[PDB]
Structures are given as structure tokens and as C-alpha cells.
């Protein structure tokens, strides 16, 4: 099955998932000088005050913090979006080294990691239906660089020892994702895809200009996770990112001048 190794990595995905070579694949390089300011873009509306986190899961590709998405408790609206998108989970992609790890790049620059807050369009009723629609998902992407610690991330870091291997989950209630956001909500936006199989072309990407900083100790703890299940040969969960894909017939829009 698919993964991030030499024999099952991003270069191989197209064989099982031909959409990997499609017209609106993610991630992409964000060329800051070619992106166009769109003064008609509304400010992002992030309403996470009633968020209800439930669980944290190691799924063998990353770890997801999952939320109760059975009502409008934590939603994203505005920006390039029409309607309401409900937060279902967030996860990260990261590197084996601080110099790589993000999926999107900015003028070819790689960050140490990238946070994805995944939301689905409520007009489609549930996540499974949404991923089958061109405007089904909105993913808010946030770059991580290594520097000072991110206090709001620490609760996540501290539970990782309990979900070291594939298939492990742990209760994770009362986590506030507002603690993972940078100060500015300035963003770039473009139409794209899931960055892992099945690579469905259902995502409006909203990538924040301002990275958050996390400590070297924090990202080191990400790199102690395992891709494998318990009792299988240990393979560290690192470099779980897809490289930048061709932009093709798309324009990246900026919310800021
Ligand atoms: N890295 S990402 O583009 O933000 C992403 C990548 C994958 C999923 N989820 C799934 O792929 C789960 C699905 C299985 C079958 C259809 S969707 C997701 F919800 C978000
Ligand atoms: Zn992701």
C-alpha cells in the first residue's frame, strides 16, 4: 500500500491513483511575486470557540486530532469560501530535518512542518460526500518553523508517546485549536486536492502567510512517532510530505498586498 518510502512514495502513487497527475493537484509552490492580490477576497472567519476535540489517532501516515463535527461547533467561513465549513480534524506533515517537512513551499522555501486544519462544506451533509465535490473541503494550512516553543502545541506533543504506532488512539478532549494559529490571518488561496491518496480534487486551499514557531524539542517529538504498527519493524514517522506539484492552469490569489 501507499506510503512515503522509496518503493511506495509519491512517485508511485499515480499507479493506484491516476488523479495524481491531474489538473488541480496539491501541494504547490507559492510564487509570492506571481500570486495576485484579490481585493475582493473577504477576511477569513475562524470560529473555533465552541470546538470539541475528541481523540488523537496515529493512522500510519500522520496523527489526527479529531473533532465533533455533528454540529457547527468549529467552523471556517469567509475568505474565498461560500457557505460554512466544519472542522473535522487537524494533522501535520514534517521532515527528518528542520530544512524540510512542509508540503507547500514559498518561493521554493521548505518549512520544518505544515499544519492542516481540515473542514468540510456543510451543504454536503458529511465528510464522505464532501470529498466527492469540487468545493467539498477547505483546508487551512499553516507553516511551522523551528524557533521559540508554541505553548498551544504542547498538549499535542505530550500525548504522542501514547500513540506511538499505527492504529493507536487516545482520548484528547478539551483541546483548543485557536492556540495553533499565528497572529495574522493573511493568506494565499487556490483550488487543489488532498495531498495523500486518494488525492481527490475537492479542496479549496487557504495557506497562511505567517508561520508559527515551534521549538526544536517539540518537532523532535513528532519524529519519534512510528509509521509501523506495534510489534512490526520500527520505521520513524518522518518526511511524510508530498513534494510540490505542477500549478498547471491555476492562479494563486493573495488576500494581502
Ligand atoms: N493532507 S490533506 O490534504 O489535508 C488530507 C489528506 C487526506 C485526508 N483524508 C483522507 O484521505 C481520507 C479519505 C479516504 C477516502 C476518501 S477521503 C484529509 F482529510 C486531508
Ligand atoms: Zn495534510
From Swiss-Prot:
Q: Give the first-level EC class, as a single word.
A: lyase
Please list the residues that bind Zn(2+): 91, 93, 116
Descriptive protein name: Carbonic anhydrase 2
Result after altering residue 195 to A/C/H/P? Strongly reduced activity
The annotated modulation of its activity is: Activated by X-ray, histamine, L-adrenaline, L- and D-phenylalanine, L- and D-histidine, L-His-OMe and beta-Ala-His (carnosine).
Phenotype for residue 194 to F: Normal activity
**Compartments where located:** Cytoplasm; Cell membrane
Q: What happens when you mutate residue 89 to P? A: In OPTB3; in Czechoslovakia
Task: Supply the alphabetized keyword list.
Answer: Acetylation, Cell membrane, Cytoplasm, Disease variant, Lyase, Membrane, Metal-binding, Osteopetrosis, Phosphoprotein, Zinc
Q: Which PROSITE patterns match?
A: ALPHA_CA_1 (PS00162), ALPHA_CA_2 (PS51144)
Q: Enumerate the active-site residues.
A: 61
Q: Remarks, anything else?
A: Target of drugs used in treatments against glaucoma disorder and breast cancer.
Report the outcome of residue 103 to A/Q.
Answer: Strongly reduced CO(2) hydrase activity
Consequence recorded when altering residue 114 to Q: Strongly reduced activity and sulfonamide affinity
Please give the annotated consequence of changing residue 103 to D: Normal CO(2) hydrase activity
Q: Which cofactor does it need?
A: Zn(2+); Co(2+)
Annotated site (Fine-tunes the proton-transfer properties of H-64): 4, 59, 64
| Mutation effect (residue 15 to E) | In Jogjakarta
The record describes how the cofactor is bound as: Zinc. Can also use cobalt(II) with lower efficiency, but not copper(II), nickel(II) and manganese(II).
Source species: Homo sapiens
Amino acid at each position: 500500500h501507499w506510503g512515503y518510502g522509496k518503493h511506495n512514495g509519491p512517485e508511485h502513487w499515480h499507479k493506484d491513483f491516476p488523479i495524481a497527475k491531474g489538473e488541480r493537484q496539491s501541494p504547490v509552490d507559492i510564487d509570492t511575486h506571481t500570486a495576485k492580490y484579490d481585493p475582493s477576497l473577504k477576511p477569513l472567519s475562524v470560529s473555533y470557540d465552541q470546538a470539541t476535540s475528541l481523540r488523537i489517532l496515529n493512522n500510519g501516515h500522520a496523527f489526527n486530532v479529531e473533532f465533533d463535527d455533528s454540529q457547527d461547533k468549529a467552523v471556517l467561513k469567509g475568505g474565498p469560501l461560500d457557505g460554512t465549513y466544519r472542522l473535522i480534524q487537524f494533522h501535520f506533515h514534517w521532515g527528518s530535518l528542520d530544512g524540510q517537512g512542509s508540503e507547500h513551499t514559498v518561493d521554493k522555501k521548505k518549512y520544518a512542518a505544515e499544519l492542516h486544519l481540515v473542514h468540510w462544506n456543510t451543504k454536503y451533509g458529511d465528510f464522505g460526500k464532501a470529498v466527492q465535490q469540487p468545493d467539498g473541503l477547505a483546508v487551512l494550512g499553516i507553516f511551522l518553523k523551528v524557533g521559540s516553543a508554541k505553548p498551544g502545541l504542547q498538549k499535542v506533543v505530550d500525548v504522542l508517546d501514547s500513540i506511538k504506532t499505527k492504529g493507536k488512539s487516545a482520548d484528547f478532549t478539551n483541546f483548543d485549536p485557536r492556540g495553533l494559529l499565528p497572529e495574522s490571518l493573511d493568506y494565499w488561496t487556490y483550488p487543489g486536492s488532498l495531498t495523500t491518496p486518494p488525492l481527490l480534487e475537492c479542496v479549496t486551499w487557504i495557506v497562511l502567510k505567517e508561520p508559527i514557531s515551534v521549538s526544536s524539542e517539540q518537532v523532535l517529538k513528532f519524529r519519534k512517532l512510528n509509521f509501523n504498527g506495534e510489534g512490526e519493524p520500527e520505521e520513524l514517522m518522518v518526511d511524510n510530505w508530498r513534494p510540490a506539484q505542477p500549478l498547471k492552469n491555476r492562479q494563486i490569489k493573495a488576500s494581502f498586498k
